[PDB]
Amino acid sequence: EFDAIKIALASPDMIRSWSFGEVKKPETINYRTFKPERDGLFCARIFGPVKDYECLCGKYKRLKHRGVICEKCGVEVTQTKVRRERMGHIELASPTAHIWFLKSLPSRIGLLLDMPLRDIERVLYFESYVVIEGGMTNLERQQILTEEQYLDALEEFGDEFDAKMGAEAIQALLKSMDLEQECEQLREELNETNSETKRKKLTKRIKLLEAFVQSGNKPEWMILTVLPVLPPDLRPLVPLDGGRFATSDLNDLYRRVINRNNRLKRLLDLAAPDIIVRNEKRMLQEAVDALLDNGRRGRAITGSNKRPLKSLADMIKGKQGRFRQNLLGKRVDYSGRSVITVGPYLRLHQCGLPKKMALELFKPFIYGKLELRGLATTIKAAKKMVEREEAVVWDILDEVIREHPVLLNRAPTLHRLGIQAFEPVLIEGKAIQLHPLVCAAYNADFDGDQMAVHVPLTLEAQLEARALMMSTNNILSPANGEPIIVPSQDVVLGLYYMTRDCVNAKGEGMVLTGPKEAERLYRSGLASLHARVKVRITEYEKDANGELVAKTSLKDTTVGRAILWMIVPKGLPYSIVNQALGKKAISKMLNTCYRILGLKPTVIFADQIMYTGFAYAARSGASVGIDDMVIPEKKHEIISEAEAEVAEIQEQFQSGLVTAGERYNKVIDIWAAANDRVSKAMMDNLQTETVINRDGQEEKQVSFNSIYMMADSGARGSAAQIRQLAGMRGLMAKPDGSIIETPITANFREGLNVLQYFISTHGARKGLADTALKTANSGYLTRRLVDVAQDLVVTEDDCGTHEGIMMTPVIEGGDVKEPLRDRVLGRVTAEDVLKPGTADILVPRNTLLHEQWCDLLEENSVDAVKVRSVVSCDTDFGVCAHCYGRDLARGHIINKGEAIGVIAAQSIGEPGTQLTMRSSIQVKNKGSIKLSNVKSVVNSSGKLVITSRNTELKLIDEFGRTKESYKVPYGAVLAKGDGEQVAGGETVANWDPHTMPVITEVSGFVRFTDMIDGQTITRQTDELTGLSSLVVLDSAERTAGGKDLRPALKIVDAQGNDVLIPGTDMPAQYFLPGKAIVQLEDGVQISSGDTLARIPQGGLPRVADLFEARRPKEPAILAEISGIVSFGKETKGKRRLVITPVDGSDPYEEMIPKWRQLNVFEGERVERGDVISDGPEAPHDILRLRGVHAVTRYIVNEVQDVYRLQGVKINDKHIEVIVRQMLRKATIVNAGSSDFLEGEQVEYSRVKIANRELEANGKVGATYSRDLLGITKASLATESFISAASFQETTRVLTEAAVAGKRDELRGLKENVIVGRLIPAGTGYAYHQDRMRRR
């Protein structure tokens, strides 16, 4: 029916076109009778039939009279629906400014005129005059006048010269403005002002002008004259219980505004003095804006309860304006809600449902089939049949819920598994029964969680339910390929109890031919369950073309392993069950079952292991007891020696031999050590306490204590929690955030004292309070970045490109903390895998890497693969599938259509709750030594020192892969060198953190050049040795008389010649900064690598500040461009630099906060994007200097370290893709044959097709520069204004787009749900292939 949404500012006669009348009287209803009046608010003859096809007086009572108006009041007969939308106007007397354009900050009126807003406010509230059309005066056409200086003007140019006040003057002055002279003139003044302030203000000026004329508006419409009134039924008058009436605010202030207007009219009739009508016009001004946006004016207004009433502006904004309140989230029919419970006897493709809720939810279906069978003809018969509960209907809703799916919902619906579908089985009773394996996916414990259900009505949605929403579909997480239908807690207890063995039992080590006999031995009770017996089993495998082959042997095993072997389907190896089967082993068991045997055997296998899980768990009889928790007997003695040790350090403080913090730290360390002694004390006491005979004397084995099974199997808890049970619990923190010196010596099996418990409840309250406010922030994070992505749809097959990023296994600096094969798994490569067989192609360039390929290059020890990423996908308005890869819940390629931006958003969002709250180089393992960006020199001692900070120490193994990474300091004494072999566990470096060395590289003399004692340096003898040294000060301590003098230690030989820099023909001067202590005196001939001077010295919102992309506290300063450097002018707010590039010019220099201890030196020649000092590495310059791939790789390494610190998995594509939504905008560097302004921001896709088809022309396109934006304002910088209108600051984007005249073809999602059509993501992507294909 209709395309794009267009807005514009409102013309006056447009508003006259909208109305059907003028409101004139401030009443609304009778109150005496109950009638609506002639031309009040609730009007009939303006707004229409309050009754239905009937007049007010009831003149035309039938449907026959339809078409003619009445005459006793004059109302047209139509439906009563028509009073919902017929608008009305009011004609105000004196004009009135619209405050959105007045106080959007920046004001459109304000910078449109370029007069300060304070003066406009002085004109508006009548305390000042201002002159239109100055002309022949000594006084300008836009000058404000005070009233005594208007008395002055009243004297002198009190002639034909004119000056007015208020919104009349604003309409007049703003009306008489010519626009084109402003355009050309301000383009000219943009050509004049060298100041970037004036260039900025004038370019905003020229933006609003040249956009203002370009849209078909008029300036003078911005002063409101004819106010539209809202249709009456949307501002309804309801009664409360009794004769009173719950008012609306809107009706109240409409009453106020037309009372105001009419009184002003009669005052103009009576010719009152200017004081009165002045005051009244000011009252009308506050009246009108009090209608528009109450509260943005300096004091709001209240009607009753002294509580500020609601205008129209807050009716849109905020948590209950229409966008988030009634447009994205609506209340729905056909729903029910109650409390969940289990009922484990269900299969997982079905759920329980109560008979009452079923008989309520499906009532129209009952009507339909009940009409079909003819048990009752007419409808109201069926009404009383479904009311009175006759026995036939239980057959009927028994029938119609045969294959009709339903949906379930749990309220904190974080990630998309919170909605799954089931097939209802009717239940006696009235709670909802639920299959157990769904609970972990819902995170819904049975502590009293309620769930809600829904019913898809139509046919296609039933197919969407069974097709996609059905719970058998989703078994893998969208976050990662791990199964989410892992058994939760007690079935793993049962199976862990199944596959175990005490060392001597009934039927110890007999033989058996097949697991059925083992079942007969168990249920006959002739052998124990945990008892080992060599049996015969037989298995299958599909090595061939999926071909299953029988083969068999006599495995030695337990009984119970052979028992649950019967449940396993055909294609498995045996040794999947030949162990104790912890939670991890059964999890990857199910995983490989999915990888090898497809879908359905994994499904029915999972149900069956649930059944035997509860069977043998119940038959097991796993209790707990007070006698089960065992106190280690050594606990008392370890605590005893510990308190002796704090008595020893304490008496060191009694006579004061030690300080406070030293006693503090030693005491807290020995409590840490003794605490650990108690920890492995109780572990060694528990884990293997069972010592028994075995047809012989004695033997130890693992413990049958209930706790150790419950923690060992992975059911609940860990060594930490049982550590808090048996052994002592912890060292609790203090409210300061520091740590208390006396640990909680007791444990929960014994009694805590008073104060240990008191300290503990401090820690607990601080904990769950943090959970409350942390939840509050995490929801806001997801709420934000779901909006900034929102729109990215996999829409094409293959971009056909060769760009992308380079995946490597990451190393923290110690162990590999994330290998290669998971960062690579399931992402199609960029180029082909050259095998490290030299010139062999292992894997071709466009292949999916499933597990076989990953094993293939896994064997050949490939270290790096360039891969296709979504940041490099060349697709306009989308992403090709061959740049994205796998579904991660559907084990294949991604299909065409899946809007993966939101699953990225939920995917990073759901761990937001579970985030946490509260030298030298020593190698470990053995390999070859590798260094990179090395600028080294052999010292006098045979060691190695490196004068480049950017050198990195790596450990290549004996195969070729890197296994360690270490920073090489500027001038660190290395014990070894590059390409060398070391042994694991060897120190290979040395430096001082308490010395920045000013070391050398050559041999010769060092002369005291410019080391003048008192201006640059100072005489500071060493009071400990006697070797006095001339200490070089910094700028702020030395006086200005020799501050421009740079003390240098320049390398000369025995002849004094410039010992040049090795390689070039520049002298080797060592300019001396602050805290540089020149120990080696004058005339001292130096060695290599010797210090000529010595210079000594996070949580969730970290992540939110990374996608916020903030400038950090001080940025690490970096090199804009390659070339040499020097220094700049002394202390000008800061001391400056001077940078001199080699080949091109040297436009770049900068004041530097000299708290930044510099890293580079003057003779150093560097590359762009390289460090000058260090600190936090600001992202914008990584974009603008090191490029696109660098900044993305920086981001994903950063936040991947954050989540990976907590051990919370997320595959890397999601961070990639929302970054591609971050850096979508760009700016212009040159137009070329483009038509854009150079100083203009535009999205990169639109300029990419712009020059891309200017490339189709002979002409050159444009040159661009990309930007990254914080997501909370990147979403505001979007072409679809409704999308930003659903986000924050609705007023700002609404006015700005409103004066823009901007158009919106909707090309996206939440606007397509905001308008109510097919979403263009899933099936509606095929529908928009259709509607796109027509036009």
């Binding site: 304070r118 509230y125 009372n259 009184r263 009669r266 003095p273 004081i275 005051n279 300096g298 009607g303």
Partner: protein, 307 residues
């Protein structure tokens, strides 16, 4: 340092604080000026003959009872029978003045204005006469714009030659035949619009024939009336500007009856305007006591129907 005082009350105090309180004898001084204003416009009313024609005709509407006994008169100074001797006697004065029109004519116009000056009327008749001379100035003004438009904007007549000889007579051909007799080239262009100016000036001669006066004399009547009227309005504005402290002082009482404050102060301003309209100083009371009633009328009226 005007501290963006977004309360309109605050700045409203800043304006009303300019005028200080007047004593009660200054009210005698100002209401004296008011009596000057209405009395002088009653003099200019008395100097209008068609007021006396329409007066006697409306008296025939009174005794014909095509009007009412209280729709023409509001008592006199120094019962339709008094109106029979007064308007029958005034009919005799009107015919004895009307006979002698062919000097002493204008003396009998003066004495007719004096026997009429005793008379007091219902103010709708005052509306009739103000609008009567008002429309009279609109027709005169129309001929001013017409002959100015055609002679100046058509014949290139200098406005110095227009205002000096033309303005004041406006019905003769003395500016016409004498200005064309000045032998100027604009004056020879005055032959171009002699029809529209002179023949449309014939209705203006008809205006002087209807009123029995020249345009200049009528301009003295209604213009001098306008001087007295503007003077009286200056007095009334001045008194209101005195009594604003009264109206806020009484406005403190009825505040929280479900309405805002400045609504009350404006309604009370209306009420004191009406009280100015209905006060007399020769009564001998202080103004405020009489004013109080009109203020409570405005307030209780306004909150009463604005519940």
């Amino acid at each position: 340092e005007i501290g963006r005082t977004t309360d309109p009350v605050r700045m409203y105090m800043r304006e009303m604080g300019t005028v200080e309180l007047l004593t009660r004898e200054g009210e005698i001084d100002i209401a004296k000026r008011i009596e000057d204003g209405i009395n002088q416009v009653q003099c200019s009313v008395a100097e209008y003959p068609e007021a006396i024609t329409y007066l006697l005709e409306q008296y025939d509407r009174v005794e014909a009872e095509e009007a009412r006994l209280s729709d023409l008169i509001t008592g006199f100074v120094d019962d339709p029978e008094l109106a029979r001797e007064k308007f029958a006697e005034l009919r005799a004065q009107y015919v004895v003045t009307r006979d002698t029109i062919k000097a002493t004519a204008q003396e009998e116009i003066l004495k007719l204005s004096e026997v009429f000056k005793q008379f007091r009327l219902v103010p709708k008749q005052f509306d009739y006469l103000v609008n009567s001379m008002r429309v009279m100035m609109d027709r005169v003004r129309t001929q001013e714009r017409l002959i100015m438009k055609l002679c100046v904007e058509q014949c290139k007549m200098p406005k110095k030659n227009f205002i000096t000889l033309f303005t004041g007579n406006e019905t003769s051909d003395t500016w016409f035949n004498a200005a064309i007799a000045m032998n100027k080239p604009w004056s020879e262009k005055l032959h171009d619009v002699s029809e529209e100016v002179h023949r449309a000036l014939q209705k203006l001669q008809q205006i002087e024939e209807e009123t029995g006066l020249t345009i200049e004399q009528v301009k003295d009547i209604n213009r001098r009336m306008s001087i007295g009227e503007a003077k009286a309005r200056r007095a009334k504005k001045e008194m209101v500007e005195a009594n604003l402290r009264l109206v806020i002082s009484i406005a403190k009482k009825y505040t929280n009856r479900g309405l805002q404050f400045l609504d009350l102060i404006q309604e009370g301003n209306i009420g004191l305007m009406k009280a100015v309209d209905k006060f007399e100083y020769r009564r001998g009371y202080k103004f405020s006591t009489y004013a109080t009633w009109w203020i409570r009328q405005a307030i209780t009226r306004s909150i009463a129907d604005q519940a």
